[model samples]
Target: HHHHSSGLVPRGSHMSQPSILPKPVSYTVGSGQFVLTKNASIFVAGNNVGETDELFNIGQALAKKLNASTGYTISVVKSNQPTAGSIYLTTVGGNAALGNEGYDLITTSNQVTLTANKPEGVFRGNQTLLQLLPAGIEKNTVVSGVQWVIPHSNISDKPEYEYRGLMLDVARHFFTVDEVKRQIDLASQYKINKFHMHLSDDQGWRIEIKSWPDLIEIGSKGQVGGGPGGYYTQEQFKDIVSYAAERYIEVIPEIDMPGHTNAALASYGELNPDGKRKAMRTDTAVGYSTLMPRAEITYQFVEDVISELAAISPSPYIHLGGDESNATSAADYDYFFGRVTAIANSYGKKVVGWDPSDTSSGATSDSVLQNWTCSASTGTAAKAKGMKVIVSPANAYLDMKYYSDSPIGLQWRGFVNTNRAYNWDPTDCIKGANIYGVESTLWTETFVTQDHLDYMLYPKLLSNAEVGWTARGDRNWDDFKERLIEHTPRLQNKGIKFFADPIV
Candidate 1:
């Protein structure tokens, strides 16, 4: 290394010395300030949050302290660019750490700045900055900062898929109301904007329908295999929705029909045509004694229940449980769907169904399809007919299984692994078009507890989130796994315990 007189100098290490391989790096947060490097400048970009602008002021003051103590130059870029020999913060919208879609923290020419569309982005940027410091520090102790040299780079990053999502099967396994909200918080933190609430399954009916009093009292709690389960109260669910809204996440409630309605039908004999009663559990495999698709009364019940759900849920998309209706005889297909479609349209809402719904009847433009357990061709066929498809193929994207299933021999979902989940692309080779987006499904019949929920979700869900967020050009197994490990602290803050390093 050769030193030029004008070259910026770092304390202890001279410009004439060879670049160090692994100079020990570290971090510290005290009072209100966070210092990333002793040799780099720190800048604050936002204002105070209290009577005296305590929040943003504290951030800026902290930066001043770091700059004074370490001689790093901090300033706000006011626009997007590579930073130079300094850490920039935004008094307004510049956030990279907050996980909000609108913020940006870009590094260039040995400089970094917080840039965002809103103030929250600035805060997120601060959080991300803290994470870059070395691990393990004494509480409230300000220490000498580490030196980090930024390289020349350019990255225009944003989410690739707008609908990164995860479905929580609360009905199959009764989680506390707080548990649902916790799930919502985690999803929002990861930039997943959609949260699918599987409210009803064959095992139980989890939501409340005032028109159908028994829907909650009896339908809420049923047997697991058509056997005993639990349900969430209407008030509890309403609170969950409000909680999710605060985090910028939408809760799309699913009330499965025909096939998943066995428990609901069992709860209220009137939903069935035989005028006889059966316990909530269906005991037999799918197709036997399923929702009587032919009966006019069934349509009425479906409409009535869905209308009730729509009243409670304001999301524009309503799941009509159109998946796997085996009892729907081929002769009655059109007759039944015509009325079901009419019912959905009458509610002024859009209908989303599973792949079987489109295949059972003719492909219809109005229905949204969730294609799972099949090839991408299934989604292509639906999309060709003007239907939007959600691809969640078992081989490529099923998250409920284990990561070592195929690559190794870990149990669960027989052998679905994390590598398969990460490598799968919704748009791969699908004729004229690609998949709308991918969804991670958790069928509660097996995973019914919160810990179990976390185990199945993390690691894979994180990769899927990146798949939906990062472009194909930027995606790489090595890099993504590295980023996944770096996310441990954030996951810890969210109380998530994941198998951080899973090979494809």
Candidate 2:
């Protein structure tokens, strides 16, 4: 059980190991330590203003951590050149090979250099720099008698796909802005850049629309299990968008339409075919409710909501929930899909939908089909039509219970232990599909607390990161298992309540 492949060691080795969640593409481990002293200066070049601004923020965050431990403040300053016992962040000319989000890092005994083509890459490199430090670096409070050091190394890293993401279903069980921010903080560390927020579902509508204020005023009043539901006001959503953008994470807002319109239907009667406001049901799963597809009021309401969301969101893709529209006729459904897609497009946002939209005649070639069901047929068809595909097979759904006896989560999509989560490759899994990326979804139907959210995401969440970033041939489960086991301490240090599965 203590075996490992080359360039990796079993847990608790004295040898310095780079336990990055998404293993880097290429790296060379070197000797010595880049020690951080109390007087160390964080330097950034004046020419790299955009990247330097990000580095300045990152340096301040790191300084807070180090100061908490050592009781000393480190200053971040713009400099034309590097200084000894300092951290330097800079942007260089384009290396077409490295691309926009790729970065090169080199750490010597006295200085640390992080270089990238763009600010996003510099942000990622800063995350890697933090990981290179002692696990105690993640601790909120400082402790004495430990050297603040990072291993000497050279790393060239980039992601396998452009849209690595994590989907958080806040409709089933609402998470506060702070809770969402916590997820963004953790996700950025692993180079995951997209935050897909399942904002509107049957259980709740979690974003406020000014034109249709009752949607949140009434629809947001309840959630699954009859708990107190919540909604984010327009300003609150803008704050979240700004927060995620600062961290280089794009927040993709999802307003599920047609099928999961129970929340919306319960808010206003005019939008429904029956013209009767339905009583809000907090304790239920997907129900037989939908928006009146042919009604002018329905399209008017939907267009208002989409326009409001597009105003606050900077992400290119807007998800139109297109799954399980069984209540509507096929013709009506197709018509509704086309109208919604066009509405989003008119607002300058690309449309993303579930597998149902992949085969829909109304779904344009520009729409992105997120493959949630494991069936490859949908993705294959989408790819054949030159549409992009996001592979999030049901088996890899993090919300799915790990095993039969798991305490929480649904197993409707089959159990997803670490092995099952790690074993699949996006490209090979769906042959001929235009695999854009992979996403691990956490649907919080059974989840009631922050601890429940943390428990489901960890262990498997790291595995999903690996699947998105690492190439199929370069990935090894045995090595990943070792790195993961060793990475638990860091997770704990960061106050992440990660489930330490005995199987891992």
Candidate 3:
């Protein structure tokens, strides 16, 4: 299906059709191309001061990126004339098919105009606009004799799910602010709006807790294989949070509690059943440690952590890890769920947990359960509990190996080559569940660097991104692979180091 609502007659000699990943909902490539030149400027239109500031930020960022490679002194202005031989970005009104994050991009030889109900949609439209240009657009240096020509097109696009996300387990192995920012940037290119940071686990505590100084002082000292682990200061974590916001990505900070708390227990002995601090365990294991949910100090700790986390993280959701609490008695686990939910709500924060978290006896409609089990039953039951679901099956786990002999990956859930990662549908997995979205998790048990993360994320992550952004009924693996193949050069130019295995 195509839409040339502009009704422009086809023009010869400029006939070019560039591939866009996470393909737009409705698009038509008309004849002729828009040659971006040094004279071009960016125009941002907003309804109010705050909206204008946000839209201006997005418009300026796009210009800066283009200027890096084109060596053009393009300027961002506070105006708009759709066909005025410049780029225009504007937000639309309500009762529109193009939702808040959906955009209508119309490009002709004279100009490019992007309009959406929100600035987020303009950002998304800009991504498609960038994809339309030559691959050299990704290079930081100007290329010789290459033209910045974007084939004229009309595209209407929006995400299938509102919560497309990428979960990074910083607890297993702490990635630096720059590295995490890099991942956030890459994910946003494909329209991911959520970043779930697993902030604590058995091996390390990755985010600073101001009130609990020893959590970082003692718990953040080790990683898997006894490597030098680290934690992010409150400022650094806030930096990461704000940076993601600029890109229209929400940072969901997670403190996997009750279980995966060896690092927490080791920091303060009182957190354990006994008032004796345990030595930190720097290994890859689960279910061995648990928080004493019955203790009054436990609720106090939860209140302080939730209050501080909520104060720093504006996102309405906070993750209370309720998975693998094998050490906690069933009664205590059930009791903890009710109490923690209250603590979270007191801070005006909603809760998110693993599939097992659906068993959160006190979970409400505001809560969410992330399903990694790949079971329809889990999704169904979660919805029955009046909670939403984030589907990230084992097949889409970024840290999984691509093959049996992979150098730096875990194979617990077998391999997840590109095809295996893309072929599944979340709606089908969680038949009756109200799905918030899909996420690909990168657990860093075997990951320790940016390159390592890239090898496991790119290409496969691209597949899942498409799965998340494209309409479920409209998706076709073959069509997505074709676009992905064309999009590879852009990834290469950006030094993403994606997997090279053939798309099956």
Candidate 4:
């Protein structure tokens, strides 16, 4: 506690112990510190060849970030120690306590050593390491008059649930590859391991299907309000996948089915019950179009989309949109969901869908239901059927306007104030289910530009991270708000235009 209280030092440079977002499970501050300068190099520990290479690549990524920020050549050192400061990353002896995505970070006056049970854990530890240093290290350009100092500390951290996620609705409005990559960067920083991409909706279809070429050729042409919507070619989607994978973030691509098929129906007449292509919808209306249930052509379309998407995505689960099927009768909904779920299963992929249409009888034991509407009975039913429930109550919807006068976002599900967003517990609404975690959605209807997306997600997305990752007893509204205030400059330094919540 005797670290100097120099007026010259930035607060980020001299914290007794840095305040980390989605705070670590256990952390203890120490007396001394380690200075990361231009001479410092990062290295991976352990002797296993494959493991070494994996951690080495992760280390190289961290090195690149440091190099860009500090104008330092923080190169990766293999099998040798560097003369200056050294940051060691390893998975040498796995920690059963740490599990697959948990890590232990230890920093002392001399050197730093971080160990994890898996590669994902190392990627997570890297985020903590960055936060430990001066916030200026987040800048793309090197900042003068600041020390990139990491305080001495020991932290053992892991998430309470495995499914911490942020869903970005790229259908109503498509985000570019770079934007999604940037999103992954921000979300991963807070230990959000999943990116559930809403790739299809009534307004547009955002991912390509090789078999259904016309789907993208025609269906991808319109966004809400006719904003020149576009689709990701197979290669572009692959790029996003790889980018997220490096950060240990899994991309769950969703093709909303039955309902939210207006774009698809408009592209192919065969997909429609009337056998005539409909007009493309460039508006926000939903539940109008439905893929012809039980038709051979409908199965073919579903199979083609699921097969290509499964092939492209490493995530074992593919989200089939299952909500707001007003056009589909109860029996027809059950038939279509039962069939498409089997189609996904046939490809060796599990299915994930929103609540309301219900998890049909054919849904596999491992299948997941994303409970966004927070109807308690829905969670109970899914659990009774032995399915994992991802709680995403509409109360926490990120796309909801913060207040009436808030510029971007909708208030259809009611406004989510800064505190109201983070105060609720997922278990309060859903019980006795195999709850995987939580997800906060950012439907992009109003998010035409990048900044609006950032504004809505930033502080709220961070809240979602803490809620999903930190256990209930570990979280407190005031404590999180305090840490968030400390994290604001770092967010700004990364060029994230977050709304400074007036409530804060």
Give the TM-score of each candidate: 0.71, 0.94, 0.94, 0.95
lDDT of each: 0.57, 0.82, 0.83, 0.84
Q: Candidate 4: which stretches are off by over 4 Å?
A: 1-17, 80-84
Residue-by-residue lDDT tens digits, candidate 3, 1-504 = 874311111441110547688878888988888989989999888777788788889999999889988999888888655445688888845226878789988889988888888888888888888888898898777766888888888888888888889999998888889999989988888888899999999998887788998889999989888888998998998999999998889899999878888888889988877799988887787898888877899888888888888988989999997888899887888789878988999899999988677776777878899888866467555777778889888767979987777788998888887777788888766777788889899999998888999999987888888889988788777667667767777888788877775543
lDDT of 4 by residue, 402-421 (tens): 88999989988988866777
> Best to worst by TM-score, what's the order?
4, 3, 2, 1
Error of 3 at 70 (Å): 0.6
- Give lDDT tens digits, candidate 2, residues 1-504: 686423223352221655677888887878897888888888876245776676678667656656775666888887747788998877755355877788898999999988877777877777888788777777777767768787889998888888789999999999999999998888878888889999988889999898998888899999998888999998999998888887788898999988888888889988766788888877656747788888888888888999999998888889997888888888888888888888899999989998777766666778899988756466665776788888888645999887798899898888887767888888755777678898889888898888898888887888888888877777888778878877888888878887776557
Highest TM-score, which number?
4
Clashing pairs in 3: none
Highest-scoring model, lDDT: 4
How many clashing pairs does model 2 include? 2
The better candidate by TM-score, 1 or 4, is: 4
* Candidate 1, 361-430: lDDT as tens digits: 5435767777764554566546666777676656333444563332222244355545556665667624
**Candidate 1 overall lDDT versus native:** 0.57
